[PDB]
Design a protein around this nucleic acid. Structure first.
Lengths: 108, 108
RNA sequence: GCGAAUAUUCGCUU
RNA sequence: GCGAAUAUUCGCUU
C-alpha cells in the first residue's frame, strides 16, 4: 500500500516547483488518508508547504514536541524524509499528518 | 536518516526520464548503503531499472520469493513504493537492495 | 492499527 | 540491526 509521499512523486511529475505544489494540492485535497500507525482515517483538506517533519506542535498536556519526536516516542515510527510537507485535517486545532506515514484511499 | 528512495527525489530533480536515470546512476553508483533491517553495509555498484519490489529472486534453499514477500516474512519490513528500481551489489550472485530500505553513507 | 516494558525461546546475504 | 512466538502489564487525535 503506497504512502502519500510515494503518491507525490508518482502521480504527477513536474520540474516547475509552483506547478508541482498546485497539482499535488489539487490531487490530494479532498481525499481520505489512513495512517499506518493508528487505525484512524482523516480527510486531507489542506497541505502545509511551510511545515516539515522537524516542525513542532503543542500536545494536549501542553508540552512542545517535533513530529520526528512525536512518532518516534508514541508509535515508534521513524520519519526518514525531512523535506516533505505536512498535511492538515480540520475537525468538528487541526491534525497535522505526515505523508510518509499515511496510506491512500478513494474518497470524498 | 534519509533513505536511498528519499535521496532519488531530493538530490536532483529532472523531468526527462532518461536524464533522471543517468543522473541517479551517476550519483549513487559507488556509494555505500546501510540497510535499516540488518546492520550490514553494501557498496551499490549498479541500479537495475528493469526490476522493482514485485520482482522475484531465488533463495539459498532454492525457493522463489518476491522482494515484497522476502522483507515482510524475514524482517517484517513493508515496502510501500512499487515503482522504485532495485540496487545491485556484487560480492567476492549479487545482492538486490531496495532503495526504500537503505540508508545513505559517504563512501568510496 | 502502530508500538513500549519484563521474562523465555527463535529467524535473518539476496 | 530488523523482526517472530508465548505469557504478563502498559501507551496512543495532532
Amino acid at each position: 500500500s503506497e504512502t502519500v509521499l510515494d503518491f507525490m512523486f508518482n502521480f504527477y511529475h513536474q520540474t516547475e516547483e509552483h506547478k508541482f505544489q498546485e497539482q499535488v494540492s489539487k490531487e490530494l485535497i479532498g481525499l481520505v488518508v489512513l495512517t499506518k500507525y493508528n487505525n484512524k482515517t482523516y480527510r486531507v483538506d489542506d497541505i502545509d508547504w511551510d511545515q516539515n517533519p522537524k516542525s513542532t506542535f503543542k500536545k494536549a498536556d501542553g508540552s512542545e514536541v517535533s513530529f520526528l519526536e512525536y512518532y518516534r516516542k508514541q508509535y515508534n515510527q521513524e520519519i526518514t524524509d525531512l523535506k516533505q510537507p505536512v498535511l492538515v485535517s480540520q475537525p468538528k486545532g487541526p491534525a497535522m499528518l505526515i505523508p510518509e506515514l499515511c496510506y491512500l484511499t478513494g474518497l470524498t
